[PDB]
């Protein structure tokens, strides 16, 4: 009886009685289809639940996540570039999104750019009509 209906990867619990590919979707920064690509390339039985697995396959699953480009995945499929003038690629995950979210705010804040002011005040940044739209909340 290896039914462990709880898992713990990278500081957040995930369920186990659901399917394997959809369980990784719970993690912030990865979606339903991005999960499919990497979970397909790790050669895992997609037809079974996320509870009946074991440690060794999990190890390759998580390993792909940190270094994607080394394991034959294209660059345009990724979601990070130009962290500085001479930048590299990346694949941000659960708590890096909040960390890099914050960073952007004081960058734009200190530069004193218009987008920062909208973010500072908290209005819509992308241009859209507001005089009657979503002002209640």
């Amino acid at each position: 009886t290896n039914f462990n209906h709880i898992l713990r990867l990278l500081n957040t619990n995930v369920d186990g009685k659901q399917k394997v590919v959809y369980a990784l979707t719970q993690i912030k920064g990865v979606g339903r289809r991005y999960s499919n690509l990497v979970c397909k390339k790790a050669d895992v039985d997609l037809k079974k639940r996320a509870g009946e697995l074991t440690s060794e396959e999990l190890e390759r699953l998580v390993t792909i996540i940190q270094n994607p480009l080394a394991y034959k995945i294209p660059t345009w499929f990724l979601n990070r570039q130009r962290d500085i003038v001479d930048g590299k690629d990346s694949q941000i995950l659960a708590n890096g999104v909040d960390s890099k979210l914050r960073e952007d705010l004081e960058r734009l804040k200190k530069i004193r750019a218009h987008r920062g002011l909208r973010h500072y005040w908290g209005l819509r940044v992308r241009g859209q009509h507001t005089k009657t739209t979503g002002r209640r909340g």
Binding site: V85, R107, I111, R112, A113, H114, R115, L117, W121
Partner: protein, 94 residues
């Protein structure tokens, strides 16, 4: 933007910046230039000057920092004052 050709107006303003940088004496900040155009991307080559960009009513001068290479000069002078608001009028009764 840079793949397409650049017309008289970009070259004109760049030679003004060049003249300011050469005649500037070290241990001083270069002189101020006022302009109306607001569609130039920021270039790392364009560092070390002070530009008064027109905000639709007045010229606003800002010191340029290096790490803002990927924006425009227009994005740094707002057009409208923020709305503090007031007291509701004789409307909003029906």
């Amino acid at each position: 933007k840079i793949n397409r050709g650049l017309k008289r107006r970009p070259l004109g303003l760049i030679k003004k910046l060049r003249k300011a940088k050469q005649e500037a004496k070290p241990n001083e900040k270069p002189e101020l230039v006022k302009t109306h155009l607001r569609d130039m991307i920021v270039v790392p080559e364009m560092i070390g000057s002070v530009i008064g960009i027109y905000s639709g009513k007045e010229f606003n001068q800002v010191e340029i920092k290096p790490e803002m290479v990927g924006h425009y000069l227009g994005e740094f002078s707002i057009t409208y004052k923020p709305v503090k608001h007031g007291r509701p009028g004789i409307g909003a009764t029906h």
